[PDB]
Design a binder for this molecule. Structure first.
Ligand SMILES: *Cc1c(COP(=O)(O)O)cnc(C)c1O
Ligand SMILES: *Cc1c(COP(=O)(O)O)cnc(C)c1O
Ligand SMILES: [Cl-]
Ligand SMILES: [Cl-]
Lengths: 381, 384
């Protein structure tokens, strides 16, 4: 019913194909299926099921709310599966997390005190992962005095039987630019900081630093576990890394819509807000009923590609809240016709990366921000 | 329980400001009814709550894009007044035209396929349709072109009225350049709206309302008001354009405040990079604040290195790239406690940035800033 306007087709078979492709590239490691941000706009639970089915033994989320929803899923995901969440703030539901058997990242002393406190109240121990700041400079614990202290506080919490440090981990800043100096720097600092913590008595199940581009291009970086997010959704972290086809990967999301309106307009007739496109001669206009409220970026005004009626069209002028227009040369498809904004590539459609370029951003943002008003349709469940 | 997800971040929706705005707007358009446009989840502010507030303060029409949005308004519990008019315009073939006619929605029709589908549905349902013909005055998006197409649509509508299947309750259009005051096209569209409406009345159509006015029109063009105004963005207290003015210039107060709690405050040496691609490196020794919102939450990635955030009493600006769930600010050397409030935007009166300030940092319009705040950011409603 709502699918008639537009839809995001989520091909869960492609997803499973990707997870397998990725388990091949990282043969000596477990794979985490990162399903944060509603599985990058693809649907958290469905994608998480598919990714376990195909060999993911860890799930990854940002917020603890996301991770708890995975654990509350009906039907249940395997209870034996590990679920990690990293984005915590003071007063967060640390108790509910320890009870639900989540792996929780800790990168700072306030969090260590809060998680330890919660393990006491709950009675059962915590699974904690220390985040090390290797150079990224976002979240993460800085080396030297802060790391010393956190490693130590973790060691005491292990003594007292309140938690076991199940991992040591970090994140790359520039892995998507292959052979950039910082990659090697962060990597040897990850080895120093991990070595230090093991040398002082911590015994983790897993070390991990690898995001998608790392996983694809740096076998040194794999360690016990990989976190290829975007690559699991079949999209390349960077055109410098390669196409999805280069790594045996197939895009999972196809974004399509039905033409609301096909109409003939004379020449010198403006199109959309600010009249930033006026028709060159007499022509036809197609109304695609998706706009920036649906996550069609407004930066892709005048540039965004759409396959309509067998040819690539491009957005004519500005993108509105709910709609945009394409110039159809003089072609006259029936209203209701399919307008495919992006997909895998094999039916002549543009890809998510093509929209990333039109909008001056990364493909990550294109898929993740597809609006909740666009219903998701799941195929090959 | 849900008082747990607010700790990371929240969008505070001040429904009293919204009611203040709907009144300010009814004042600017004294000879007209006001439609509260609550499309796109009330521009990211929450459709139903805002719709209630807007009715409370004098809106006698509600406006949506999709028929799904409008049907949800009609299904609201507790109910909105049954006497209130709800219009929806963004239709595609095979859409739920029957459910719309039954639910007593005003439906836009701008094309012959739709006229046939809506008429067909009125037959099946047995009760007549309320239809609004959309006229293409110059915008060139979804209306009916003048001349041969308008002639035909007006005529098909007239026949449908004869047969008792629908009554054309409105004739309407939309401005392309009203946000740029005195642009030539405004006057052009407006006189073509008068020609096309005159034509349809002259041929026997008798509408309840003519309307063309969006927010900027409503604020700057009393000629444009006609029977009804559709000020969307202005109702949420944000100015359609800095060229039109500030919200304060029109007695309007922004409804959404977007705030978050610092996840991390930490000291880093100089020459230490920040975020993806190392597009900010620290000038000397300094402090970094982690704000736990990213582009998945609708913090535009175009506002990398530029986005303003009030933290600890001073405006900070985004340090380098915005990630999926987080960004960093350079805090000089200040050391606020983690859990401290980071206000990204609001009304302006506590020293915060506004939605327009983010629009500029990201190279876009404020409309996009508020509308695309993610569903993973819980909304908190105050003064309901
Ligand atoms: C976002 C994220 C990932 C996956 O993202 P890619 O860049 O697609 O690999 C992995 N790990 C962490 C900690 C993240 O925050
Ligand atoms: C978007 C929209 C509006 C509101 O425009 P503002 O500039 O936000 O006031 C009004 N009417 C229709 C038909 C719309 O699509
Ligand atoms: Cl980090
Ligand atoms: Cl139009």
């Amino acid at each position: 019913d709502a699918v008639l306007r537009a839809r995001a087709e989520i091909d869960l078979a492609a997803l499973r194909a990707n997870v397998r492709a990725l388990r091949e590239r990282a043969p000596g490691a477990a794979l985490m299926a990162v399903v944060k941000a509603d599985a990058y706009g693809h649907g958290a639970i469905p994608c998480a099921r598919a990714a376990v089915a195909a060999g993911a033994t860890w799930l990854g989320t940002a917020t603890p709310q996301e991770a708890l929803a995975l654990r509350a899923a009906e039907p249940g995901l395997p209870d034996d599966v590990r679920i990690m969440c990293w984005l915590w703030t003071p007063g967060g539901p640390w108790r509910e997390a320890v009870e639900a058997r989540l792996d929780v990242s800790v990168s700072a002393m306030w969090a260590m005190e809060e998680v330890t406190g919660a393990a006491r109240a709950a009675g059962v121990p915590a699974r904690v992962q220390l985040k090390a700041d290797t150079g990224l400079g976002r979240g993460g614990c800085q080396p030297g005095a802060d790391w010393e202290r956190l490693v130590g506080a973790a060691l005491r919490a292990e003594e007292e039987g309140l938690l076991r440090v199940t991992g040591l981990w970090s994140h790359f800043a520039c892995a998507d630019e292959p052979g950039h100096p910082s990659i090697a720097a962060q990597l040897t600092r990850f080895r120093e900081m991990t070595a230090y913590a093991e040398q002082r008595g911590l015994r983790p199940e897993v070390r991990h630093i690898a995001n998608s581009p790392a996983t694809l291009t740096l076998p040194d970086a794999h360690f016990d576990l990989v976190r290829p997010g975007i690559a699991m959704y079949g999209v390349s972290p960077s055109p410098e890394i390669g196409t999805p086809a280069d790594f045996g990967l197939r895009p999972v999301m196809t974004l399509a819509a039905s033409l609301a309106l096909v109409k003939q307009v004379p020449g010198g007739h403006g199109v959309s807000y600010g009249h930033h496109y006026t028709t060159p001669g007499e022509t036809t206009l197609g109304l695609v009923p998706l706009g920036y409220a649906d996550g069609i970026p407004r930066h892709a005004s005048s540039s965004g590609p759409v396959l309509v009626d067998g040819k690539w069209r491009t957005v004519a002028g500005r993108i509105a809240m709910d709609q945009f227009v394409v110039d159809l040369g003089g072609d006259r498809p029936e209203p209701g016709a399919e307008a495919v904004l992006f997909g895998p590539g094999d039916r002549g459609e543009p890809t998510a990366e093509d929209w990333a370029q039109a909008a001056g951003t990364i493909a990550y943002e294109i898929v993740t921000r597809i609006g909740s008003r666009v219903p998701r349709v799941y195929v090959n469940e």
